[PDB]
């Protein structure tokens, strides 16, 4: 297989009339399609159920974007049988053939990108550029993993020779596993977590987040059109604590690929460590969990550059990112100039229905709204509220960009992942204290430093203990291939997505010697 060198899919900014025209038409068609029903996908066919999952428009939750079928234990069992049956032959496909299947799926996704973006806008309340970034990242995962998988092809292992013998070590896929995905990047992360394992010969049962079942179905439309053999990928929208837990705990699930909250990841990792009755392997579980990500700014920084990057990092997709800047750590000399600039920029942010392409759409659900507002109440008794802190008028789940300042490093709002548009500002003496405060959380996902001082940047390179660190730029939007993505500590197991290493997680090695 010879293809062009990997390049990232450009993210559409909708500055041209052509782009606007295409997006308007895509939004119109998706809107006109509200109420559509999407079945499960098991063993190469769409399979309906009596019960259903309902997906609302968070900008106008009286509106049903669509419904899907709902997978319970029986459907989980059918999916397991289909996946294991498929594994038997899928594992034996030449890698070139599997990689070509991924490239076909990428081409099909690229041709439907405006539709998928529009679906994100309505289903999870992304503005237009956030939706475009999500779909572009999904395409990137497919393109990248298709190529990366070839690096593991038979027989890939470097071994020491021995006289009179052939010694051959090679990788093989694990089997059938479950992918359990979040609602905040329900095209990108859903796609990446499925196609990585599948590329190298595993089969997958995919459980999309409840709030993002429709766009998950559309991804499966693409898989089906691409022509993955029956059973290779299966789509099981359903309740996480029910069908998700059922699969995690199952003796016949070989691996678990999970991205989501720490609370859930902890349960999954613990369950994975247990030998279910009749289980005949040690389960592999990859859990990529939340963060409490900080940007440090010192007195040497470009304060205007810093303020812009902080606002993008804190409020992009309403702060609903594992990578979002939820802490702003300012040295004494940076405090007033940066805070004033951040407040001025943040107070100008628009909030409204995602279809209008505002700066911020709504948060994803009534439950998310309730949690963010609850943390705002907690914050009022911990730090000083200096911007926002209110639900805005409207049926949609609109929350104003919020800033607390003089926040104690150990305050709940400085330690716990809020996952909404709520920034906590922490005042410290100097760069050394900034790093101490940055590191003193249970998490270790993303971080940033704005500084012109070389020694501070290189110090942070060595000691700001996060998996994805950025200097003099935003801390969100890690690009596949460019920035291997994944954290330390309670931000998860450090499975680095969009990196060569990711696929190794879904392989085991055999060593075969023949003495002639």
Which positions touch Na ion (CB under 5 A)? 55-56, 123, 211
* Residue among 281, 308, 387, 433 that touches its own copies (CB under 8 A): 281
Taking contact as CB under 6 A, which single stretch among the options 226-234, 243-251, 344-352, 383-391 is the one that binds ligand NAD? 243-251
Q: Dihedral angle at the C-alpha atoms of 406, 410, 414, 415, nearest 10 degrees? A: 180
Q: Which two tokens stand for residue 178?
A: 């479950």
Task: For the segment 401-440, give every residue that binds ligand NAD (CB under 6 A).
Answer: 417, 419
Query: CB–CB of 324/312 below 8 Å?
Result: no
CA atoms of 416 and 505, how far apart (whole Å): 29
3-state secondary structure of 62: coil
90 is an interface residue for its own copies by CB under 8 A: no
Which one of 23, 65, 136, 181 is in contact with ligand NAD (CB under 6 A)? 181
Query: Is 323 annotated to bind ligand?
Result: yes
CA distance 197 to 206: 12
Q: Is 242 annotated in some ligand binding site?
A: no
Closest to 425 in 3D by CA, of 440, 413, 442: 413
Q: Determine, following the binding rule CB under 8 A, whether residue 97 of this chain makes contact with its own copies.
A: yes
Nearer to Na ion, 63 or 416 (CB): 63
Strand pairing report for 45-47 and 422-428: unpaired
Considering only residues 125 through 154, tell me which ones interact with its own copies, judged by CB under 8 A.
154
Give me the least distance between CB of 270 and its own copies, in Å please.
5
Q: Fill in the per-residue mask, 484 to 513: x = in contact with ligand NAD (CB under 6 A), - = not in contact.
A: -------xx---------------------
Tokens of 390: 């209110």
Q: Which does 455 bind (CB under 5 to 8 A by kind): its own copies, Na ion, ligand NAD, none?
A: its own copies
Q: Which tokens is 286 given?
A: 């990859």
- The torsion angles phi and psi of 43, rounded to 5 degrees, stand at 55, 45
108-131 burial, b if ≥16 CB within 10 A, otherwise e?
Answer: bbbebbbbbbbbbbbbbbbbbbbb
State yes or no: 143 annotated in a binding site.
no
**128 annotated ligand-binding residue:** no
Answer for which of 17, 18, 50, 282 binds its own copies (CB under 8 A) is 282
Minimal distance, residue 157 CB to its own copies, in Å: 7
Q: Is 412 exposed, middle or buried (0-12, 13-18, 19+ CB in 10 A)?
A: middle
* 288: annotated active-site residue: yes
Which one among 59, 95, 132, 184 touches ligand NAD, defined by CB under 6 A? 184
Given 115, 130, 288, 355, the catalytic residue: 288
Query: Which one, 184 or 257, has the nearer CB to Na ion?
Result: 184
Site string for ligand NAD, 253-292 (x = CB under 6 A): ------xxx--x--xx-------------------xxxx-
> 443 is written with which tokens?
């998490």
Q: Which residues of 437-462 are buried (b: 16+ CB within 10 A; e: fewer)?
A: bbbebebbbbbbbbbeeeebbebbee
- Which string of x and - marks every residue 471-490 that binds its own copies (by CB under 8 A)? xxx----xxxxxxxxx-xxx
Neighbour-count burial for 7-34, b at 16+ CB within 10 Å, e otherwise = ebbebbebeeeeeeebbeebbeebeeee
Does 468 show up as a binding residue in the annotation?
A: no
Closest residue to ligand NAD, judged by C-beta, is 240
Pairing of strands 52-56, 446-450: unpaired
Partner from Na ion, ligand NAD, its own copies, none contacting 264, C-beta within 5 to 8 A by type: ligand NAD
Q: How far is the CB of 185 from ligand NAD (least distance, A)?
A: 6
Distance of CA 75 to the CA centre of its chain: 26
Token pair, residue 168, equals 């051959």
Q: What is the DSSP letter of 461?
A: H
Helices (H), 273-331: 303-315
Using CA atoms, how far apart are residues 346 and 356, in angstroms rounded to an integer? 19
Q: Binding site: what residues are annotated?
A: 181, 183-184, 207, 210, 240, 261, 289, 322-323, 417, 477-478
Q: Which residues make up each annotated binding site for NADP(+)?
A: 181, 183, 207, 210, 240, 261, 289, 417
Q: Which residues bind ligand NAD (CB under 6 A)?
A: 180-185, 189, 207, 209-210, 240-241, 244-245, 248, 259-261, 264, 267-268, 288-291, 322, 417, 419, 445, 491-492
Query: Which residue ranges make up the annotated binding site for L-glutamate?
Result: 184, 322-323, 477-478
Residues with catalytic function = 288
Annotated binding-site positions for NAD(+): 181, 183, 207, 210, 240, 261, 289, 417
């Amino acid at each position: 297989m010879t293809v062009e060198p990997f390049r990232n899919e450009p993210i559409e900014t909708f500055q041209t009339e052509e782009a606007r025209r295409a997006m308007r038409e895509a939004l119109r068609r998706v809107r006109e399609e509200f109420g559509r029903h999407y079945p499960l996908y098991i063993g190469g066919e769409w399979v309906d159920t009596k019960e259903r999952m309902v997906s609302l428009n968070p900008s106008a939750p009286s509106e049903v974007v669509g419904t899907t079928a709902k997978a319970g234990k029986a459907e989980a069992e059918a999916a397991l049988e289909a996946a294991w049956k498929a594994f038997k032959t899928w594992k034996d496909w030449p890698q070139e053939d599997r990689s070509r299947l991924l490239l076909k799926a990428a081409a099909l996704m690229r041709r439907r990108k405006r539709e998928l973006e529009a679906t994100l806008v309505y289903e999870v309340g992304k503005n237009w550029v956030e939706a475009s970034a999500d779909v572009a990242e999904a395409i990137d995962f497919i393109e990248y993993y298709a190529r990366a998988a070839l690096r593991y092809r038979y027989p890939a292992v470097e071994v020491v020779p021995y006289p009179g013998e052939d010694n051959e070590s090679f990788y093989v896929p694990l089997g059938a596993g479950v992918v359990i995905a979040p609602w905040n990047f329900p095209v990108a992360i859903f796609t990446g977590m499925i196609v990585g394992p599948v590329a190298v010969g595993n089969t997958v049962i995919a459980k999309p987040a409840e709030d993002a079942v429709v766009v998950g179905a559309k991804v499966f439309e693409i898989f089906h059109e691409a022509g993955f053999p029956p059973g290779v990928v299966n789509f099981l929208p359903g309740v996480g604590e029910e069908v998700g837990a059922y699969l995690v705990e199952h003796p016949r699930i070989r691996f678990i690929n999970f991205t989501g909250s720490l609370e859930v990841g902890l349960k999954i990792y613990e369950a994975a460590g247990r030998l279910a009755p009749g289980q005949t392997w040690f389960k592999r579980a990859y859990v990529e969990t939340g963060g409490k990500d900080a940007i440090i700014v010192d007195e040497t920084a470009d304060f205007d550059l810093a303020a812009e990057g902080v606002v993008v990092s804190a409020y992009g997709f309403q702060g609903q990112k594992c990578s979002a800047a939820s802490r702003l750590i300012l040295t004494q000399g940076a405090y007033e100039p940066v805070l004033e600039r951040v407040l001025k920029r943040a107070e100008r942010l628009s909030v409204g229905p995602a279809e209008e392409n505002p700066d911020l759409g709504p948060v994803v659900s009534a439950e998310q709204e309730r949690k963010v507002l609850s943390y705002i109440e907690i914050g009022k008794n911990e730090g000083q509220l200096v911007l926002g802190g209110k639900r805005l008028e409207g049926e949609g789940y609109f929350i104003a960009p919020t800033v607390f300042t003089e926040v104690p490093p150990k305050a709940r709002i400085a330690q716990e992942e809020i996952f909404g548009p709520v920034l906590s500002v922490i005042r410290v003496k100097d760069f050394a204290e900034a790093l101490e405060v940055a590191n003193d959380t249970p998490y270790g996902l993303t971080g940033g430093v704005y500084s012109r001082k070389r020694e501070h940047l290189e110090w942070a390179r060595r000691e700001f203990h996060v998996g994805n660190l950025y200097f003099n730029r935003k801390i969100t939007g890690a690009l596949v291939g460019v920035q291997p993505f994944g954290g330390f500590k309670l931000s998860g197991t450090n499975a680095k997505t969009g990196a060569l290493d990711y696929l190794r997680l879904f392989l085991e090695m055999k060593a075969v010697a023949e003495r002639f």
